[model samples]
Target: NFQLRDIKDIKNELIRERGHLFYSKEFNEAERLEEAMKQSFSKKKAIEGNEIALKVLERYKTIIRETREKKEKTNYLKENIEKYLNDAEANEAYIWIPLEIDEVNNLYFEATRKYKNYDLDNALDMYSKAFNRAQQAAKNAKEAKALKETDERMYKQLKAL
Candidate 1:
């Protein structure tokens, strides 16, 4: 029951607002639908135009939902990795821990760049790598702390002897 003009207006609004959905397959589908709509309008085909507009709106909605989900996942990974890094640094963990943290920072930068480019898959992959590295860094820090305590205890026993 939706009018062709109403459908076209909704499609235009989606295209204008969902800029982050660019470079995705769904975006391409939306573009194709737009072309079809234009052709149908030129031929005075109201029903065909309405159909293409509906398809365009549907595809745009799908793209918007997908982009939102991807951004949520990327943000979650970013937040956890940051937390891990802060925890490791606050623990005064030294030795190889700093080296691992540096690697994580590099991966995080790459992920940020990919995200800005709208490459969600690669961004997520990089973020996951960074998160894993951050987790390892935290583990190493804990182990180093335990080893330092053991060393201090052994030194005290030697001094007692």
Candidate 2:
């Protein structure tokens, strides 16, 4: 049978690592542990309460792992989008390219804000959308650059005619 102090210690541990509880699913488990901790003290059911706490801890550990994986993927997409945006700017393509880039930039900002607020799903979605937008912007920039080159070539040919 676990002691009351042991349950208290487990609760403290959960509280200390609360930041890792990104999703509401994990947060609800943490809340369950808190309730169990309270019940343990009131009803002297330390063994049952400690079991629940330990289970929550196990679930939380796995949750942290999943959250880390998602976070890394989101960051990877964000970096790629940034690179694409920079490439588009360097190409100096069409007038609308900058406008499209601005839209992508706003999506990135929103994603960052969602990530900061622990809304990982929305953050990932936003980053994915931004990446697609950035890709299109880069493509447009390349096409515009090609068109400009063709126009310059035509002008030079006419001048020499």
Candidate 3:
């Protein structure tokens, strides 16, 4: 009962969505379905009009969207951790955020390792702890007039009690 226009529209979506997979060179239900589709199109008897083909395209689209979302999330986590590390480093001279505080440094190294393993949840949590400790170290040190003579711009902004 599917109209020709409907069939072509769904097929176009499949091709467009598949373009991302091909471009990213990433795979899999979408795996067998994609292969079947590729073979079908290759033979010039493309099954896009078939009910099975329609179902396959829908499933593949879902998989592709999920894949892209996870990738985006992972990228965001990586970038955030980088920025946190840089900011923590910039404040290190004052209170030695990373060096003086053993936990923050330890947490940072752990976070780095977790991320390398692609464990986003723990990596993000640990890095967040490191970041918080870094900021706190600077805040606590800001109260010490004795600690106010640092050369770093970050240290200069904090007034000593």
Candidate 4:
């Protein structure tokens, strides 16, 4: 039967085989298992972001994408946890990612529609969406770069609340 000592042996073997070659795992089995795991995790992520239920965007975007299609980028990030270690915090704790993205998208779109003739206001509204969504996703620093740039460039016109 499989035992903890076997795991210890594997660890020792890995240490001994470091910089060498001693991996005994079958290539085909590994690949098959990896593919299966990818699909499983992809589904979980999709469901969490409401993508699986809505079929709004692709299942796994960080790894695959066709630009975007009427979906907020925050939705994409919350759905794809690139930082393996922060999976829980990035998902459950960061619910605001998708929520804020949706809010910003709607608010910006509405503000634009209301003031279509006012070019400056429309531009300002775009900025607000950027700032709000970025702020909301702050819990997940992994996306701070893009979010920060977007929020900064969209300054001066965003709604205060």
Query: Candidate 4, clashing residue pairs?
Result: none
Tens-digit lDDT string for candidate 4 (71-158): 2343343234223224324544344355644554466556455334323334454545644454454445446545666887778457
Residue lDDT tens for model 3, 95-137? 4443545666687789878766645557667877777776665
Quote each prediction's TM-score: 0.82, 0.74, 0.42, 0.23
What is the lDDT for 1 in model 3? 47
Model 3 stretches astray by more than 4 angstroms: 1-33, 42-100, 145-161
> Residue-wise lDDT of candidate 1 within 1-161, one digit each (tens)?
56656645655655664543544676776777778888998999988887777787777666666676877898999999999998888666556477788899999999999888878889999999999988888888888878888999999999998
**Per-residue C-alpha lDDT of model 2 across residues 101-145, encoded as one tens digit per residue:** 889999999999998888888889999999999999999999988
Q: How do these models rank on lDDT, best leading?
A: 1, 2, 3, 4
Task: Between candidates 1 and 2, name the one with more favorable lDDT.
Answer: 1
Model 3 weakest 10-residue run by lDDT: 18-27
Global local distance difference test of model 2: 0.77
The alpha-carbon RMSD values of the candidates against the true structure, listed in the order shown, are: 2.7, 4.0, 8.7, 22.6
Off by over 4 Å in 4: 1-96, 122-126, 138-161
